[PDB]
Design a protein around this motif. Structure first.
Motif, PDB file in Angstrom:
ATOM      1  N   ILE A   1       0.927  17.208 -12.132  1.00 47.87           N
ATOM      2  CA  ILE A   1       0.251  18.507 -12.103  1.00 47.87           C
ATOM      3  C   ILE A   1      -0.058  19.033 -13.500  1.00 47.87           C
ATOM      4  O   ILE A   1      -1.199  19.465 -13.733  1.00 47.87           O
ATOM      5  CB  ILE A   1       1.069  19.507 -11.264  1.00 47.87           C
ATOM      6  CG1 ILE A   1       0.990  19.119  -9.788  1.00 47.87           C
ATOM      7  CG2 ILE A   1       0.559  20.928 -11.481  1.00 47.87           C
ATOM      8  CD1 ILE A   1       1.810  19.994  -8.878  1.00 47.87           C
ATOM      9  N   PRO A   2       0.872  19.035 -14.461  1.00 46.10           N
ATOM     10  CA  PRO A   2       0.562  19.588 -15.788  1.00 46.10           C
ATOM     11  C   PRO A   2      -0.665  18.982 -16.453  1.00 46.10           C
ATOM     12  O   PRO A   2      -1.600  19.713 -16.797  1.00 46.10           O
ATOM     13  CB  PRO A   2       1.836  19.296 -16.592  1.00 46.10           C
ATOM     14  CG  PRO A   2       2.918  19.266 -15.567  1.00 46.10           C
ATOM     15  CD  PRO A   2       2.291  18.643 -14.347  1.00 46.10           C
ATOM     16  N   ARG A   3      -0.682  17.658 -16.635  1.00 47.31           N
ATOM     17  CA  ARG A   3      -1.806  17.011 -17.307  1.00 47.31           C
ATOM     18  C   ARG A   3      -3.138  17.502 -16.753  1.00 47.31           C
ATOM     19  O   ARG A   3      -3.958  18.076 -17.479  1.00 47.31           O
ATOM     20  CB  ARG A   3      -1.698  15.490 -17.186  1.00 47.31           C
ATOM     21  CG  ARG A   3      -0.371  14.917 -17.651  1.00 47.31           C
ATOM     22  CD  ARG A   3      -0.456  13.406 -17.801  1.00 47.31           C
ATOM     23  NE  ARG A   3       0.841  12.760 -17.625  1.00 47.31           N
ATOM     24  CZ  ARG A   3       1.014  11.446 -17.518  1.00 47.31           C
ATOM     25  NH1 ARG A   3      -0.030  10.628 -17.570  1.00 47.31           N
ATOM     26  NH2 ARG A   3       2.233  10.949 -17.363  1.00 47.31           N
ATOM     27  N   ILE A   4      -3.366  17.289 -15.454  1.00 47.83           N
ATOM     28  CA  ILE A   4      -4.615  17.730 -14.838  1.00 47.83           C
ATOM     29  C   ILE A   4      -4.887  19.187 -15.188  1.00 47.83           C
ATOM     30  O   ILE A   4      -5.978  19.538 -15.658  1.00 47.83           O
ATOM     31  CB  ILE A   4      -4.572  17.512 -13.315  1.00 47.83           C
ATOM     32  CG1 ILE A   4      -4.685  16.019 -12.989  1.00 47.83           C
ATOM     33  CG2 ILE A   4      -5.670  18.318 -12.630  1.00 47.83           C
ATOM     34  CD1 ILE A   4      -3.385  15.254 -13.114  1.00 47.83           C
ATOM     35  N   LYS A   5      -3.888  20.053 -14.995  1.00 48.21           N
ATOM     36  CA  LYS A   5      -4.059  21.460 -15.334  1.00 48.21           C
ATOM     37  C   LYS A   5      -4.712  21.593 -16.706  1.00 48.21           C
ATOM     38  O   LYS A   5      -5.805  22.154 -16.840  1.00 48.21           O
ATOM     39  CB  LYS A   5      -2.710  22.183 -15.312  1.00 48.21           C
ATOM     40  CG  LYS A   5      -2.347  22.881 -14.000  1.00 48.21           C
ATOM     41  CD  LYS A   5      -1.318  23.983 -14.256  1.00 48.21           C
ATOM     42  CE  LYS A   5      -0.768  24.592 -12.975  1.00 48.21           C
ATOM     43  NZ  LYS A   5       0.190  25.696 -13.284  1.00 48.21           N
ATOM     44  N   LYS A   6      -4.084  20.996 -17.725  1.00 52.74           N
ATOM     45  CA  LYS A   6      -4.597  21.108 -19.087  1.00 52.74           C
ATOM     46  C   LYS A   6      -6.083  20.780 -19.139  1.00 52.74           C
ATOM     47  O   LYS A   6      -6.885  21.560 -19.665  1.00 52.74           O
ATOM     48  CB  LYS A   6      -3.800  20.204 -20.031  1.00 52.74           C
ATOM     49  CG  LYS A   6      -4.028  20.514 -21.509  1.00 52.74           C
ATOM     50  CD  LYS A   6      -3.235  19.599 -22.442  1.00 52.74           C
ATOM     51  CE  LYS A   6      -1.732  19.710 -22.210  1.00 52.74           C
ATOM     52  NZ  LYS A   6      -0.938  18.948 -23.219  1.00 52.74           N
ATOM     53  N   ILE A   7      -6.475  19.635 -18.569  1.00 51.57           N
ATOM     54  CA  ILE A   7      -7.876  19.224 -18.636  1.00 51.57           C
ATOM     55  C   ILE A   7      -8.765  20.355 -18.135  1.00 51.57           C
ATOM     56  O   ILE A   7      -9.684  20.810 -18.830  1.00 51.57           O
ATOM     57  CB  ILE A   7      -8.101  17.931 -17.829  1.00 51.57           C
ATOM     58  CG1 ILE A   7      -7.226  16.792 -18.364  1.00 51.57           C
ATOM     59  CG2 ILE A   7      -9.571  17.527 -17.859  1.00 51.57           C
ATOM     60  CD1 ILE A   7      -7.557  16.362 -19.784  1.00 51.57           C
TER      61      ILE A   7
END
Lengths: 311, 309
Positions: A270-276
């Motif tokens: 979840i975090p990675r995608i969020k950042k993008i």
């Protein structure tokens, strides 16, 4: 989970049991995009009673709080060996007696699970999602049955979410092609790419002879996805994704450009995608998706996508 | 095979061997819309050499004469049919290592079969058709191989039809969705409803538990079909029908309405279909198909279809 130009996209988690909810929320999940209900049915000697199902759905609904939880009605099949189910052998189990169809012909399962979910909806914002839908006829029959059980609960004096939202898991090419007419009947879509790609490309991932042909990033499947997304938007509704591709950082920007409304993945990602999403411009990504989905081969598409990612 | 308002539709037959050609012409067959080439591969211990295939294809091409014949490249499959192929056991044979792919990774098959077909094309108007196409990548690789073998055959001193036409058998939803891009590379389409419906609805016909769900006349499959037809027409080309559904008088009027260019069947039904096309108005059938394929249910579609009758 909103872009630099203000496009909001609900980023959620996939869960298999109550426990996983904790790890989901620890990682910043904005909801539950898919609640796998197989844990309750598998590894038992009798079907999970309506009371146990209600307990589990209540547990999750209350663990989330203000977040919405999408319950996926049973999605079992032949491969999964359930000893008390007396399965039949099929030449193509991946294409046979499984998912919604089981539920529809073994009405006990449908009744139990739908009543349990309806009862649990009184303690949180729950949504019902059906797998392997192929025809508008199935969805109409399912709405009839849902209203039957809604009234059955009313006559018993039990409370439930009267505005409970119903959706389809678009994982068959049929549902993707007749997506506009299904969007006229249900509230949301969640495509679950894995099965849609396998059925569209007529390729079994678990077949090492042609595993090299499984490409969820091919123009055919991605344009089917865009068709489903645009069908949902045409009806003032929304479409999500809960398949593995949602958790893939290579496709996140592209899917965002395509207008996808929800991402659902394993908590960890979840975090990675969020950042993008938080560092991308939605209009530029939409232009990218428009140019990409017009390519005839996966390689040219990926060239353009990675070129965009090169900034 | 022309309507009362002047729409021409080449109506052909499907054949399994040279012999069947006879039965076609007795019924007014205007050609062969697909020559199933499995007869040569089955019941053997070794691959049918290019010479045997060349003899058979020459036989058919010359038996037809001025008519065009569409030869369908190998469409083998199954759990374990021919042991000399060293098949692998697969959980889902209908979704696994199928012919078109079989040919591509066991390339000996390609050269043998394509050399035979190109050589036979010098004795009649022959066309090549590929099954189970899913991606432009596959079609491009095969066009490369076709040109390789045509030039290699030229240097060998063999004559062939330089204008040999190439087409795709659209039987996967993938090929149906990328129909416009495929039509920019090949000359014609020929739909194999048998497999296309099974793939679109995710239903195994040979599974009695959900056999009641096999509906080739459902709006999903039919709208994919219309997509392929309009893709071919957008590129100035044509699309045919080779599935069992072609031989169904229940769907022929609608299929004509959709703009279909070719019907192919086991010949027996050709008379029936012929009458219908010559006794129907193509523009009225176009309106019928337009309103029909917009219905959300198979039952409403069938209601309108039978109402036209």
């Amino acid at each position: 989970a909103i872009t630099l130009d203000g496009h909001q996209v609900e980023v959620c988690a996939n869960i298999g049991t109550v426990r996983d909810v904790e790890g989901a929320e620890r990682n910043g999940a904005e909801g539950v995009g898919l609640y796998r209900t197989e844990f309750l049915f598998m590894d038992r000697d009798a079907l999970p009673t309506e009371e146990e199902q209600f307990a589990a759905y209540k547990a999750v609904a209350e663990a989330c709080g203000s977040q919405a939880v999408i319950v996926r009605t049973m999605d079992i099949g032949g491969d999964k060996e359930l000893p008390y189910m007396n399965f039949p052998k099929e030449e193509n189990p991946f294409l046979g007696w499984r998912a919604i169809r089981i539920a529809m012909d073994r009405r006990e399962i449908l009744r139990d699970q739908l009543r349990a979910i309806l009862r649990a909806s009184a303690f949180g914002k729950l949504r019902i999602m059906f797998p392997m839908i192929i025809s508008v006829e199935e969805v109409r029959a399912l709405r009839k049955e849902i209203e039957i059980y809604k009234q059955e609960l009313r006559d018993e004096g039990k409370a439930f979410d009267e505005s409970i939202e119903i959706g389809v898991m678009v994982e068959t090419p049929a549902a993707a092609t007749i997506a506009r007419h299904l969007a006229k009947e249900v509230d949301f879509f969640s495509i679950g790419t894995n099965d849609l790609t396998q059925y569209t490309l007529a390729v079994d991932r678990g077949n090492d002879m042609i595993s090299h042909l499984y490409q969820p990033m091919s123009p055919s499947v991605l344009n089917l996805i865009k068709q489903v997304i645009d069908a949902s938007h045409a009806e003032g509704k929304w479409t999500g994704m809960c398949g593995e591709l949602a958790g893939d950082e290579r496709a996140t920007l592209l899917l965002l450009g395509m207008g996808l409304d929800e991402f659902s993945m394993s908590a960890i990602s979840i975090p990675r995608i969020k950042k993008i999403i938080r560092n991308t411009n939605f209009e530029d990504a939409k232009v990218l998706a428009e140019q990409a989905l017009a390519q005839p081969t996966t390689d040219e598409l990926m060239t353009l996508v990675n070129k965009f990612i090169e900034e």
